[PDB]
Design a protein around this ligand. Structure first.
Ligand code: G52
Ligand code: CL
Ligand code: CL
Ligand code: CL
Ligand code: CL
Ligand code: CL
Ligand code: CL
Ligand code: NA
Ligand code: NA
Lengths: 99, 99
């Protein structure tokens, strides 16, 4: 689809069998999801945003549906205020910015 | 143009007579620029991200040239680690997300 930006670009995602809402975020390198359980091992990562840095859990090779498109890649879990779909997965669904 | 997302979507902007680089950020409601002077009145605001909140100055009716497209709106100025063009100005240049 085409998504205009008058409203937040929120879409439904499905991860771990659960539906969640997430923001399509071209300003995020990385996908970051609020606290939840995921399978497998995780690795540490620190990511930085407007207010400073947070510690997250990095899970690789996680299956995630985004707006009906299937992605498999890295998901960071931690105290993000909102679920954000970053460029690592926006590229897997073929998203571009156009003007 | 059509901007793919393999890399950060950085573009040249002109604001306050200054050229800067900024990220086109669909996950940002508002435009946030690193500390600089702008003319006219301003008022204080708090804006949150990952890592918490920062205090910014809110300037209304500021003209910014974004990748050669002129737009007017509110610009927040404060200690953001990166210049961010948010939805309030992305809409004005007709930017959409497509997949
Ligand atoms: C109300 O108006 C606002 C309020 C908040 C923001 S924001 O900058 O906090 N942000 C909101 C979002 C988290 C809901 C916009 C994002 O696009 C920021 C924009 C952003 C970019 C860089 C630095 C600070 C902020 N990106 C970000 O936090 O990315 C994180 C995750 O991936 C990494 O990529 C980024 O690049 C590496 C570090 C960050 C990490 C902007 C305008
Ligand atoms: Cl990935
Ligand atoms: Cl700059
Ligand atoms: Cl200045
Ligand atoms: Cl905010
Ligand atoms: Cl505005
Ligand atoms: Cl429109
Ligand atoms: Na894994
Ligand atoms: Na003003």
């Amino acid at each position: 689809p085409q998504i205009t930006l008058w409203k937040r670009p929120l879409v439904t995602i499905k991860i771990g069998g659960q539906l969640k809402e997430a923001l399509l975020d071209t300003g995020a390198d990385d996908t970051v999801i609020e606290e939840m359980s995921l399978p497998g091992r995780w690795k540490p990562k620190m990511i930085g945003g407007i207010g400073g840095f947070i510690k997250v859990r990095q899970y690789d090779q996680i299956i995630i549906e985004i707006a009906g498109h299937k992605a498999i890649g890295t998901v960071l879990v931690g105290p993000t205020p909102v679920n954000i779909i970053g460029r690592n997965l926006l590229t897997q669904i073929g998203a571009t910015l156009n003007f």
